[PDB]
Amino acid sequence: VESFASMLRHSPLTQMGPAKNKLVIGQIFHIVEDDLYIDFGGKFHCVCKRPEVDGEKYQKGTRVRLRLLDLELTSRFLGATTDTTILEADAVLLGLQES
């Protein structure tokens, strides 16, 4: 039986290490008038803006490329015992499954 300690070491998130400028692939799951909720797959979903190039080619279920900046935007302020989580992620659009 494979326990948790062995299956965690072979996780792609462990192989990626820090989330600073990592190239990842994410599949869109919801569409807004101009915003795109792309789930790169780690914990949260990043909100990106529809570019002017091939903006119509972005539909529900499309896989796109991202450069992950931060995994979960959390920070502290004055008089806050905990942090203020944004419940999102930070990522930018580069391409849409160039293959």
Partner 1 sequence: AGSRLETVGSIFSRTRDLIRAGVLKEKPLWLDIYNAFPPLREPVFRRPRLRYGKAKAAVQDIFYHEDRIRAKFYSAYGSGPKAFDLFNPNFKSTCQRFVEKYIELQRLGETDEEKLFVEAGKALLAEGVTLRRVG
Partner 2 sequence: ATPSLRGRLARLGNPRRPILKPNKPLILANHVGERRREKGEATCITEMSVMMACWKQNEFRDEACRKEIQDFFDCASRAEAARKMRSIQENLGELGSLPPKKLNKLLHRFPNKPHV
Partner 3 sequence: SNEDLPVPMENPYKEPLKKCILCEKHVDYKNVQLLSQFISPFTGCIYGRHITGLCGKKQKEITKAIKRAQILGFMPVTYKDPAYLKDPKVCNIKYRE
Using CB under 8 A, list all residues that contact partner 1.
8-9, 12-18, 21-25, 27, 40-42, 65, 81
Extended strands (E) in the chain: 22-31, 35-39, 46-49, 63-70, 90-95
Q: Coil, strand, or helix at residue 9? A: helix
Residue 8-47 contact track with partner 3, rule CB under 8 A, x = bound: xx-------xx-----------------------------
Contact residues toward partner 3 (CB under 8 A) are 3, 5-6, 8-9, 17-18
